[PDB]
């Protein structure tokens, strides 16, 4: 329950292999604003993106709907 000797620099490096992080092999890049994120995640202005210019979504027309606004 106690180290009997002092760990060497080589043994410490070998033991610390679990602590290292793996590199990610894919990234989703917005061509305008240069943002970077995963392909399954929104990274536009609604999420955190202060560089968003809205050019990330290139078409959004939806004028017609009809309903009862409850007031």
């Amino acid at each position: 329950a106690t180290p009997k000797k002092k760990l060497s620099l080589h043994r410490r490096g070998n033991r610390r292999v679990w602590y290292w992080l793996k590199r990610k092999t894919e990234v989703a890049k917005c061509s305008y604003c240069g943002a970077l994120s995963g392909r399954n995640q929104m990274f536009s202005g609604a999420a955190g993106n202060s560089a968003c210019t809205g050019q990330c979504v290139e078409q959004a027309p939806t004028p017609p709907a009809s309903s009862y606004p409850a007031e």
Partner: protein, 161 residues
Amino acid sequence: PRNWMWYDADDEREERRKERQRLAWAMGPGGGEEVGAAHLMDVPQSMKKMQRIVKLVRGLPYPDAVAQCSLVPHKAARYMLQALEAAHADATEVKGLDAERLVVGTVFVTRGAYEPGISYHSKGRPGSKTFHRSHIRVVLNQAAERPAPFARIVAPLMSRR
């Protein structure tokens, strides 16, 4: 090459120290050709916590190094982004190096000055809650060719019909 001198001795000592390390950076490890670099001092993170992120950007090109820093939730990745952005700013606007060919050819973490504290173990024994610091040295070389981007760029969720 600075025929002038400062007025106070402190400024003169600092300027001579700066020129000595600019000598040591040239004709040493690398040096030679024109290099954009940055030194981010006193990052409020441990050396192991920074070394967790620094092993990801070692040897990568600049855009996928920014990608590797921007794809993790770690606190150290924001400081690594700050250092890489400072090095990129020096390389592109202070120097005249071409972008999209910069490779992160040298990045390492050195020790900072610690702030010693105290932790209160049981049975009256003292402890520690030392606040660790570290420094970042980033050197961006310019390659002879634009390199392989190492991470495939895919379209986001926004780019959808």
